Design a protein around this ligand. Structure first.
Ligand SMILES: Cc1cc2nc3c(=O)[nH]c(=O)nc-3n(C[C@H](O)[C@H](O)[C@H](O)COP(=O)(O)OP(=O)(O)OC[C@H]3O[C@@H](n4cnc5c(N)ncnc54)[C@H](O)[C@@H]3O)c2cc1C
Length: 453
């Protein structure tokens, strides 16, 4: 157990009650450093461990596609945690008022949570700190190397964050120890009813077509830790060999499709890296996949951790802010509203077909994600309007939405974060441009459009 994975946010006097694991980002029982760190401290104090999840009031800011995927995975998690004699408590409302009330009611001895560099998680941490007198720690269970240990600084490029992450891999890339069950079973509603009431509250804002039928197809990704592992096994066995040569072709499903399980924390990235590193495949394809799940995934947490305004124009590089400001008054070719972007009613069939894959599957291809966001900057009134539209459409319809990957990805597409300056164009400036003809020379754009009518 590396002590560099755990951070102390506030000290205090330890109580003689159950160690509380405030689960948030990592919703799994296996390969969870935060849950394992809570069981170790609970064992050292001769007291069982408990897990608490808060169903926040911000669930209506998303959709049914993310509400059902999360709660259905939590239902499987409760059975898995109960088999280890670890009881789970699902509170509903403000985590600042619920976690404070749970710790005081149940006489908690130590509170533990998982690490998330997002602003909304820091908002909960600030409120819970104000009304708790017991120790409270946080553990990085999402990244292989802790976010505060990989770099003490915002890395402006992947060429600089790669040697720092790979030099610390022999230390943090290790096997997980078995989660020991509680010694004895210790001493606020069922998730089936919370799923029924929540869906009934999200029904009027459901994504529908003109025929009143639903648009989302929930048979593409089955939720749960069991299904998350089966997806990783299928990728290593069938798709990992052809990954390095077909990750940029949206007409072929050659990606790992592990992003919805990785966002909600249903599967550990360290577990995926461990199975891939010991797998024998194309070295060019293994290097490309490890570059995506290690470098670009953890540099997204690095961007959100060392940039408070990671979702704003101020976090852009100085060369991009100066380039975008010099082309602010440039006459845009087209100006579409948020409703026209949402329904995919633009003149570009490639962008519209990309938006249709986002609305129907909740997981648009990785290559088209760059074309989908860069066109928003080209057809918006201002770079700040492009950030708002793309963030809203990402977090609302992407199953992996509301994730540091999405915020670092959108910062690269429009703001050029972790990128370089390209040829100076109008409107877009020195931001890397992706043309429609450039996509046709890379893949069958006609098949990708015909698939998502
Ligand atoms: C405009 C835009 C929006 C995005 N929105 C999201 C989002 O809402 N949520 C989200 O998790 N990711 C987002 N991404 C990153 C990336 O596109 C997706 O992670 C990817 O499409 C997920 O599909 P996959 O896991 O099957 O691909 P794979 O090739 O199997 O990648 C595996 C994993 O590596 C990581 N990874 C790979 N590429 C990236 C990347 N560019 N950035 C960060 N991590 C990466 C991911 O964790 C990914 O799950 C976005 C990127 C862009 C440019």
């Amino acid at each position: 157990m590396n002590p560099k994975r755990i951070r102390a946010l506030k000290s205090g006097k330890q109580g003689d009650g159950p160690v509380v694991y405030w689960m948030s980002r990592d919703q799994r029982a296996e390969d969870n450093w935060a849950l394992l760190f809570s069981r170790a401290i609970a064992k050292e104090a001769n007291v069982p461990v408990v897990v608490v999840f808060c169903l926040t009031d911000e669930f209506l800011e998303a959709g049914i596609r993310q509400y059902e995927f999360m709660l259905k995975g939590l239902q499987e998690l409760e059975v898995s945690l109960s088999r280890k004699k670890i009881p789970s408590f699902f509170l509903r409302g403000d985590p600042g008022e619920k976690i404070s009330r749970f710790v005081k009611d149940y006489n908690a001895g130590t509170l533990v949570t998982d690490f998330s560099p997002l602003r909304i998680k820091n908002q909960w941490i600030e409120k819970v700190i104000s009304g708790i007198s017991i120790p409270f720690f946080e553990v990085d269970a999402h990244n292989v190397v802790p976010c505060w240990e990989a770099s003490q600084k915002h890395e402006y490029a992947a060429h600089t964050f790669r040697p720092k992450l790979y030099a610390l891999l022999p230390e943090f890339l290790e096997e997980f120890p078995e989660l020991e069950p509680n010694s004895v079973t210790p001493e606020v509603e069922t998730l089936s009813d919370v799923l029924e009431t929540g869906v009934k509250a999200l029904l009027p804002e459901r994504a529908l077509l003109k025929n009143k039928d639903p648009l989302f197809e929930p048979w593409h990704f089955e939720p749960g830790e069991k299904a998350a592992k089966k997806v990783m096994e299928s990728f290593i066995a069938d798709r990992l060999d052809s990954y390095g040569a077909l990750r940029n072709d949206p007409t072929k499903n050659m990606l790992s499709n592990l992003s919805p399980y990785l966002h909600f924390g249903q599967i550990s990235s360290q577990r995926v890296v461990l199975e891939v590193e010991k797998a024998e495949s194309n070295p060019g394809s293994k290097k490309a996949f490890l570059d995506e799940i290690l470098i670009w995934k953890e540099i997204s947490d690095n961007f959100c951790y060392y940039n408070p305004g990671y979702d704003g124009f101020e976090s852009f590089p100085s060369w991009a802010k100066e380039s975008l400001n010099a082309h602010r008054n440039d006459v845009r070719s087209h100006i579409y509203t948020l409703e026209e972007f949402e329904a995919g009613k633009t003149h570009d069939p490639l962008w519209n077909a990309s938006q249709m894959e986002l609305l129907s599957t909740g997981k648009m291809h990785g290559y088209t994600r760059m074309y989908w966001a860069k066109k928003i900057l080209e057809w918006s009134e201002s770079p700040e309007k492009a950030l708002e539209i793309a963030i809203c459409l990402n977090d609302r319809y992407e199953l992996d939405g509301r994730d540091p990957n999405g915020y670092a990805g959108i910062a690269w597409s429009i703001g050029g974060v972790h990128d370089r300056a390209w040829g100076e164009r109008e409107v877009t400036g020195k931001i890397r441009y992706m043309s429609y003809e450039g996509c046709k020379r890379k893949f069958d754009v006609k098949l990708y459009i015909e698939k998502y009518s």
